[PDB]
DNA sequence: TGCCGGATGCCATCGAGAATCCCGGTGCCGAGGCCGCTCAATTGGTCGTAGACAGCTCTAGCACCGCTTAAACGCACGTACGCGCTGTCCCCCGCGTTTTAACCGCCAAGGGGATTACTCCCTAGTCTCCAGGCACGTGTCAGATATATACATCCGATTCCAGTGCCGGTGT
DNA sequence: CACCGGCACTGGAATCGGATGTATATATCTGACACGTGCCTGGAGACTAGGGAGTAATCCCCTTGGCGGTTAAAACGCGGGGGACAGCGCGTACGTGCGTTTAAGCGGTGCTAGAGCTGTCTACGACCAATTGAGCGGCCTCGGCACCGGGATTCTCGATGGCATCCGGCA
């Protein structure tokens, strides 16, 4: 199967409780597709380097050591999944 | 064969130091490994694990609650200047964030 | 080398950017030693009379900040002259700001305030000035 | 009859999630956004439930880190409304981007 | 088919500074991601200073150097004092 | 006598000094400065040339990227001059505050 | 020696920023630019210091200062290493 | 006995392969070392410096200069996204700064 | 009095293939130097963790060759990789 | 695995801030389907004997921007009308800016272009808002 | 007393002066080739182990289906906040003169680096072996959930007036 | 047209006041954790054997003062213009609430793909001994670049002449 057009799937109200968290107060009609960018290009790297992870290891399924250890690579260490 | 005595109640600590000599050994640091340097590491850990703990315990009481959980962790250690320092660029799972308004959005 | 007790906890300093914001209204000028301008009948009632274009030209001159249409009349009438004395560095500094206002616009604030609009440049500033730090009822009946 | 004033609900709003530690971004729509993309790599592959937790933690806290960085930028500028302008400076200035 | 944890090991430490008071099994998960993190930090900034000087074996003092290097003001000079104390003891008391 | 309007100076000496490589501070006091720093720590230390050629290259490296940031953040701000607010404000978003 | 952060005139900061691109510069940025600039000498000489004190020596080379520059991530290069 | 062939002429490479190896032994990265690593490594680090250099070697000609220096390196690096990206937080001594100024500083 | 050992010739070496005609300075080659050691000790250590990483003992070509995908951006990894499979295959023949 | 010719080389982009958009002397007359103010005599005349604010206020309803005094008098002589038509998105904006100023200002306004006096304020709105689409001589 | 008047305050375009390139002449020190050697790389043969390959077993990731219900989606309105225009004054830029010490060219002395020699403790490598740590099972209590309740703000009625069209009415 | 009155509504600020959000107090309920038990394999104890580094000399670099002599840079005033900052007004674009749509999460049931484990060989890299030529330290030489100066081209910017809205008189 194919998949496409998944990146509306992150809806206006989910980033605006994600900014709601970070203390904003208003936000412009034009954040939405920028933010949407930004999330994009961020998986793409990081799915990336947890492919070229697991390719190497001969496997089919993407494990969890994969991401963290991709995350460790790209400078943000992730705590509480086993590393 | 006197009875066994294991190196950590030597020298009175909780960590395992057999094991971290272990760890050293097979974990392609060096060619040898002193015989003092288990004993070093292990005290070191052990310090900043209690260190944290007792802040986490502290935040957790102050909550009014008994258990710990990774809030209380998060909170302990994101409002202590040496530990945020060490800890700048980690993620903590369910951790959220420090309560934190600017002043101009607050209303007159 | 060993210490004795715990270390000492610092806090943590967050960066703020200081708003410089509200913290009250300056439009008000502080309370002379005379009259308010609405009290003296004669001089309410020119001021009643007058274009808005005197009266702004009136407010930049006492409270040296533009007047809002509708504050502008009431800022005017609440003036009961100015708190400093003659050979102040706000005496001078008026004094200025006379010697650069049109002749035109000194005869319409001498008819605001019930002085004669005749004699030179210099004289309607004297008198202007005068008036100003001590508003008093020019006795004339309306 | 009685409505709230502009601005006192996204207080609230601010105080309620600045408390709360759940995920704010629905579960499936997250999957399929993180399998579409990894389609392209790499074709009939297989992901873990803690594989997609992960990557959605770690986004999560991502886009909060940047969003508040937007706001001191915005802030900056005496406005209270984010604005693309503060994004891009805040990602160059971040190393992010040239 | 076993693995290992620093469960039992935090866990007597949380015991000794809090006498009455628990521990999830999630902040457990990340206390073991802590104590392997900073092992890998001291450990390999240790390792490089055993090649810089270009010598074979790690002893106590490289540890302590590593110490030095990666640790905040305050936090450094508790945490040699830690380390200094179980070594006396270990050697002596043998 | 010739003068010129504020401004023209100004750029002349950003495209002087944005095409040569010599180095802007003068060694002897940079030297002293250093000498007096790395006295609290240890007494009687002793410095090669090439250690303080060194710690002074990294030192004018530093604070030209930090003025470039520097200016990004006061021109977002509709301004032409830099204020310490911008430095503040360029040191927290790179992350060397907390 | 006292008192050598006064070293740092105000024409050389000047030139520092107009290698940066700045056309005006506020009257005020002196004290912080000193006050950075120290900070960040301070941390590179501690560094550098603990480095040399490992090795038993009494002289600081450029090597300890290139490598304490690669810790703190400001790799450095044409001076050896 | 057959006459010498260094591995590097064996592979068609510039770069030293024994050296290389010598390295990779001699470093304390792992206990044992592939035969084929070494190959791949220095085939890997002359291709980078050849493409460092055909760039470096552009800018010195454009600048109506024979020899390289470091400026010449310095604006092959920073004008390149790639080589960039690599070298993001490397410092290169007596290496200038790219000549770029504000549209808004410009006069009207 | 010791030998000391640098990678001053191979660097004029490759220079005279591409640019037949062009020299280059004393201070050029200080920087020529230090980067190829740095990309050294990237690829390297990135290599030695993944040998570790799936619990093995060698260090093979193809653990160098995603060492190199990981570390270099987009278009530079597919130049690199291909330059490396070409002189394996050349050696493996010879 | 093999790839064949050399790499594409990109060029790095810079983030420049927004220059935005700024005027020195426009000295802008949009030309309207009608006949100078200073050309009819009458007009002019009026023009040449009303004071400075009434200038003002005109000069802010043709225009929108407040007029230096020496200009003043040359920038409404030389208003040609409207290049819009009725019922345009500008026809509108116009109606509305007349509705909101002061009778006494619209009588005034009469006064500068030969207008009628007399009338209901939306009378004053209509006769103004004809005369500023074709002016002609009366 | 009201014009008269010019009379500063407001747009033009030099050519001067300064800044910036371009090319001929001279020197010098750093880059580019030779030479010897010795040590690091190459060549040939052994062997014991790490890794490739061939099954088995299950675990869990995938796939399909109701349902119920909370969140997402449009739509209208109005009010605040973004943005542009204007004025001011005070702060920083440009230039000339006087100090001031950085930079450069030698002398000298001694601390501290760098390099061998000996050796002697200190740590790797083997065999036992037994006890601390890891999987499996459990039951009860701390936290989650549900209402009922009292407390804390928050926003827009009131009003109120002080202000104000316009309407309507009149000898000029 | 003009001129006044009264018949009209009109919005700033101080004062109660309901509406709604929120923290607090019991009452149930459940599944996750702290504990107990059996077992098993990895740390401890006792040795031997070989070399890594600590100490001691020995020698020579190079770091630190120290001293003059220029001369370019730094410090100090002094005007003076332009940019930061405040104030004001206008317009439209988001925040808030309501009614209608939809798919997310939950629970349940099957299916089979491959992750992990074990067993078997076997080719390959560590190891050792004997050669030998490649690169490095040392030395010598010459031309590419740094000045240095004489012209040669260009880039601002404060002088010319101009253009009508003040100021204080005077017959």
Same mark, same amino acid.
């Given at each position: ?83 | ?19 971290? @000599?272990?760890? &050293?050994?097979?974990? %392609?640091?060096? $060619? ?6 288990? #004993?070093?590491? /292990? ?28 809030? @209380?962790?998060? &909170?302990?250690?994101? %409002?202590?200047? $040496? ?6 660029? #980690?993620?903590? /799972? ?15 | ?142 | ?98 | ?94």
């Amino acid at each position: 199967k194919v998949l496409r057009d998944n990146i509306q799937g992150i809806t206006k109200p989910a980033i605006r409780r994600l900014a709601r968290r970070g203390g904003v107060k208003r936000i412009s009609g034009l954040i939405y597709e920028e933010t949407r960018g930004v999330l994009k290009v961020f998986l793409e790297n990081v799915i990336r380097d947890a492919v070229t992870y697991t390719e190497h290891a001969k496997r089919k399924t993407v494990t969890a050591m994969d991401v963290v250890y991709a995350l460790k690579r790209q400078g943000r260490t992730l705590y509480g999944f086993g590393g | 064969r006197a009875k066994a005595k294991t190196r950590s109640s030597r020298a009175g600590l909780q960590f395992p130091v057999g094991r971290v @000599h272990r760890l &050293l050994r097979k974990g %392609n640091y060096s $060619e040898r490994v002193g015989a003092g340097a288990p #004993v070093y590491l /292990a005290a070191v850990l052990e310090y900043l694990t209690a260190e944290i703990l007792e802040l986490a315990g502290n935040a957790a009481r102050d909550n009014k609650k008994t258990r710990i959980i990774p809030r @209380h962790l998060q &909170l302990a250690i994101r %409002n202590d200047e $040496e530990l945020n320092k060490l800890l700048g660029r #980690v993620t903590i /799972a369910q951790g959220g964030v420090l309560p934190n308004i600017q002043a101009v959005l607050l209303p007159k | 080398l060993i210490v004795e007790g715990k270390r000492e906890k610092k806090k943590v300093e967050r960066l703020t950017m200081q708003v410089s914001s509200l913290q009250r209204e300056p439009f008000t000028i502080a309370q002379g030693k005379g009259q308010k301008l609405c009290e003296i009948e004669r001089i309410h009632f020119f001021l009643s009379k007058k274009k808005t274009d005197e009266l702004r030209n009136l407010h930049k001159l006492l409270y040296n900040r533009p007047g809002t249409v509708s504050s502008l009349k009431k800022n005017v009438g609440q003036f009961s002259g100015f708190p400093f004395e003659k050979g102040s560095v706000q005496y001078k500094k008026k004094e200025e700001m006379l010697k650069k206002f049109r002749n035109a616009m000194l005869k319409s604030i001498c008819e605001v305030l019930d002085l004669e609009r005749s004699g030179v440049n210099s004289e309607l500033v004297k008198r202007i000035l005068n008036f100003l730090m001590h508003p008093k009822p020019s006795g004339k009946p309306l | 009859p009685h409505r709230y004033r502009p601005g006192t609900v996204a207080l609230r709003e601010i105080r309620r999630y600045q408390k709360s530690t759940e995920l704010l971004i629905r579960k499936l729509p997250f999957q399929r956004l993180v399998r579409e993309i990894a389609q392209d790599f790499k074709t009939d592959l297989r992901f873990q439930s803690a594989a997609i937790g992960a990557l959605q933690e770690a986004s999560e806290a991502y886009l909060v880190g940047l969003f508040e960085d937007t706001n001191l930028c915005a802030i900056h500028a005496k406005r209270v409304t984010i604005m693309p302008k503060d994004i891009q400076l805040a990602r160059r200035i971040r190393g992010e981007r040239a | 088919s076993r693995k290992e944890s620093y469960s039992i090991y935090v866990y007597k430490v949380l015991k000794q500074v809090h006498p009455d008071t628990g521990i999830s099994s999630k902040a457990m998960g990340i206390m073991n991601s802590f104590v392997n993190d900073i092992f890998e930090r001291i450990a390999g900034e240790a390792s490089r200073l055993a090649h810089y000087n270009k010598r074979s074996t790690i002893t106590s003092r490289e540890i302590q150097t590593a110490v030095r290097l990666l640790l905040p003001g305050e936090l450094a000079k508790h945490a040699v004092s830690e380390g200094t104390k179980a070594v006396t003891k270990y050697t002596s008391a043998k």
